[PDB]
Amino acid sequence: MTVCQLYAKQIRHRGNVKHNTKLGRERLMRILEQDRLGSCPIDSVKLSDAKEWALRMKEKGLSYKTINNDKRSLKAAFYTAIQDDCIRKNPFDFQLSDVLDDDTEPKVPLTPAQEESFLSFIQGDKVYQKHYDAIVILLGTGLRISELCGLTDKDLDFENRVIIVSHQLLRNTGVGYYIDEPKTQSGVRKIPMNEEVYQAFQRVIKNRKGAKPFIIDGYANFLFLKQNGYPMTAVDYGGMFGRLVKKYNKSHEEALPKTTTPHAMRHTFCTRLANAGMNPKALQYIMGHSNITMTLNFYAHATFDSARAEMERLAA
Amino acid sequence: MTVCQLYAKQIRHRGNVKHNTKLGRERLMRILEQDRLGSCPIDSVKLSDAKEWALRMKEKGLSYKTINNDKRSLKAAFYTAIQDDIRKNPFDFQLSDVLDDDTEPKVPLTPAQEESFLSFIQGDKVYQKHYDAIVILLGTGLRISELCGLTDKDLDFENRVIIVSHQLLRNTGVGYYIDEPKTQSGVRKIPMNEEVYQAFQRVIKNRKGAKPFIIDGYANFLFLKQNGYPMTAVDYGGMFGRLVKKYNKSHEEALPKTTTPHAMRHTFCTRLANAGMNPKALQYIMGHSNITMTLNFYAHATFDSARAEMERLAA
DNA sequence: TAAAATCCCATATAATTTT
DNA sequence: AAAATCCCATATAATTTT
DNA sequence: ATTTTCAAAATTATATGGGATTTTA
DNA sequence: ATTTTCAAAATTATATGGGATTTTAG
């Protein structure tokens, strides 16, 4: 009767998932264990009670997107039960836009000189000077942080000047490092090298030092290593950025965008190209976007004037 | 507890549909009455039985898309049936794992044959009439019923703007009617080329002897059937067929058979997409509900295609 | 010279494609 | 020389990506 | 239509720890 | 995540009467 652990039924028979999926799955479970909704009988839950849940999540302090993803998880869990011959009527099929307001504070990319002031700061700052070449690469590839982390020496071709992104190196508490196919589950992609990331990649390998024995799922010779001599992870480069941009903020009047993270580097790269008139399907391949809709979100909303102005551009 | 009865049940509980839709529903309803499947009680329908049906639909002569769309119609009906009892859906499969897709390539007009086409139309006595409409179609990529539905109130020569707010349809029994978008997303505005603007200025002067006509507050339609009433998608299509035929007997090189009013639109979108027009903007002009459709006009990128794009821009 | 095939307009109807 | 502040490293929880 | 759109799977954000500098006493 | 994606809603193809336009055979 519970929804706390009749939700556990859904995830049990949908078992083959990534580790990071198991973590988020557990989060929702403990939310249900904390929330009143958890103990409610499965056939007792009405559409009103589901809406109130969302409100409680926002009062609890969770993000709009966070709650929204949770509605979908709960929508599917019960949706099974509706199809699973248990008492049927789904309370979680509504639009969260009616209940709550989307207060998702947008992520603003860096501007051509904003990033230049950043790079110039780093270039000569002995502490974070070392990470300069990694950052340049992020702005010239649009790699996910774990895809950069996962770059082994076999994944680079300096002849054709091309990066072969075929996997990523993930680490989570408990399992340590592990290997996954890219979140580009659509497949594999090659990313060419401009001259500057090329020069950056050369220096990285040359500056590689003190690499401890480390091979996982057949992958061995990584370029980007921690102080340990072990490869970098997401959280390592993340927290590294948090100190660096803070270091920047102290000496620079205008602060960097609120979420200037490795992830933002990828965002900037894409935004630059999309606003440069790159073929939307060309950019999709490069960004490893499984969905073309995702790639389009980096293109600006169109109006009659913009469309018309464009139409004359191609006319003459 | 019959496939026919079930489909009849489904389409009953969903009546808020336009005329063409209930036409398409009855067409499928006829199939269920005729095909072996329709008699089957939904208690005893299997994934096997569904895939058999599709195989019969292929041998019948029906295209993949017809079968696939009808599959989805029937798939929907079973979704209704699971809730009120039925545990699983017989039509929850992929037609591609049952049927191969022979759907013919809809090829755009090469600028040379497009050029040769217009001069031909401009040339011969019988078809110089519709030169203006055809040029307008090509230079604006309007859907044929959006064209037929155009009136003087929908034009803006004072700023060269075409307001698509509606479409004039015509049907058997029903007659003429107009369908409007509930959302304001359906309204879209198209710029006028000097070619297009002038072409529309030469159709006003030639609109002759119009029969008295107003439908849902829409009157003075620009486009000209010789019986005094506005022309129709069917009335345009038939003419196109005759037009192309006389062209192809005159010309050795030409011309694609899929040539049709919507081929003008398909051509419009292709030449624009290839020339590098912003996808968001191109979606606006085309009036696509889904943005993915616009991108079907963009040839998928290879690593080589990705190679070129960046070597240009990334500097 | 009148005579027969066939282009043409229109439309009911069934199948295909857009999105 | 003592005490903050920083760098690097984690475990845990929430948010963004697709 | 097809594809996750009936959430998976990544990322950032936050809390805690010494040891190394940096900075005040 | 929403968007139709458990088809709606368009357009094109096929077939057939009338009526003008030029065909092949008197």
Side-chain angles (χ1 to χ4, degrees), chain A residues 133-153 155-156:
Chain A
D133 291 281
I135 298 164
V136 178
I137 292 167
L138 291 181
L139 295 171
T141 63
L143 288 159
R144 293 179 180 76
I145 190 53
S146 286
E147 296 173 344
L148 177 85
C149 289
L151 284 189
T152 87
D153 205 324
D155 295 305
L156 305 184

Side-chain angles (χ1 to χ4, degrees), chain A residues 30 60 63 66 69 128 173 226-228 243 247 263 294:
Chain A
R30 272 161 75 223
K60 176 188 185 299
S63 163
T66 303
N69 294 353
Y128 301 111
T173 293
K226 307 170 62 167
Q227 190 185 243
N228 300 15
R243 294 191 299 275
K247 200 192 204 73
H263 169 19
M294 189 73 209

